[PDB]
Amino acid sequence: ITGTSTVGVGRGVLGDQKNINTTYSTYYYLQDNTRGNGIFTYDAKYRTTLPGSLWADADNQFFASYDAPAVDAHYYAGVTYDYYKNVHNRLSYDGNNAAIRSSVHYSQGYNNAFWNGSQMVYGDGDGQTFIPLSGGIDVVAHELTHAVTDYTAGLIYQNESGAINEAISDIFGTLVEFYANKNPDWEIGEDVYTPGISGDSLRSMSDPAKYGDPDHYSKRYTGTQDNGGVHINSGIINKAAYLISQGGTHYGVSVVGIGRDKLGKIFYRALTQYLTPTSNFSQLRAAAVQSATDLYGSTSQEVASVKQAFDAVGVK
Ligand SMILES: [Ca+2]
Ligand SMILES: [Ca+2]
Ligand SMILES: [Ca+2]
Ligand SMILES: [Ca+2]
Ligand SMILES: [Zn+2]
């Protein structure tokens, strides 16, 4: 809508207070005009019809419990946008400042979130397996990253190329969590998963096997579930990415870590320059080696660590 840019305040899913960019025209709308062509947050009103209604509020204060998922979707989209702009010089997900749209309160008891090709969508959870999914900054950045991947490499959501697609989203969701300094870790979804149980998460990058996901290529899932295991086999790449950043010895293979900043630079380059819609794990390795080569030289420690990390998870 057309109006005056302003700033409101509210409380997120975890009860923390934050400022959010809104737009004023009779009502105050969740429309942030300070980033690209805008960040827009919508209310799906427990239906499955999308996008729903641009979020309208009478007084620019968002402290109602119904408000919480919208506050976080809107705010964390902004943070994710800032990460791509400040760190990788990328303007929104398409590189030309496309508007970012999210709907919250999607359906009833919906325990997922997703990018649907045009926008992000967040369930409220059922209150025991998940609380509202926009409460997790690694979740929001994971989904938004799917949009980045779709406009660049175009990795198909099937088999190995789909596992790569999921791992990239876990990797950048995590880097964005570290960027925001939001109690960062190498786990996925810990802030919104199982509010009854502390210390757990949906997936772990540092030790995928903790939840039954493979951490070596020899253990990859080869059946048909989950589109050929796109959320399962991602553990092999997540573990590789964790090793490149943090170092470690895994199945007897030792990796010298090069840290988060270089991990992000290497993977962002692989993603935007070398990967294609049908890339498999072996092609990911070549893309990553070539990226680190471009950036740091063929005899650098950085190239060496990328090679050892993929050797450690059995990807040749
Ligand atoms: Ca209000
Ligand atoms: Ca965390
Ligand atoms: Ca996390
Ligand atoms: Ca939990
Ligand atoms: Zn995903």
Give a structural overview.
With 316 residues, the protein is an alpha+beta fold. It has two domains: 149 residues, Elastase, domain 1; 161 residues, Orthogonal Bundle (Neutral Protease, domain 2), CATH 1.10.390.10. It is 38% helix and 18% strand. The chain is built from eight helices and 15 strands. The strands form four sheets. Strands 4, 5, 6, 9, 10 and 11 form a six-stranded mixed beta sheet that branches. β1 and β2 form a beta hairpin. The longest helix has 22 residues. The protein is globular and about 60 Å long. The N and C termini lie far apart (52 Å). It binds calcium ion (4 copies) and zinc ion. The site of one calcium ion has 6 residues, from β12.
Please render the helix and strand layout as text:
Layout: E1 4-11, E2 17-25, E3 27-29, E4 31-32, E5 39-43, E6 53-54, E7 56-57, E8 61-62, H1 68-88, E9 100-106, E10 113-115, E11 120-123, H2 137-151, H3 159-180, E12 187-188, E13 203-204, H4 225-229, H5 234-246, E14 248-250, E15 253-255, H6 260-274, H7 281-296, H8 301-312
Helix pairs in contact: 1-2, 2-3, 3-5, 3-6, 5-6, 5-8, 6-7, 7-8
The structure holds calcium ion (4 copies) and zinc ion.
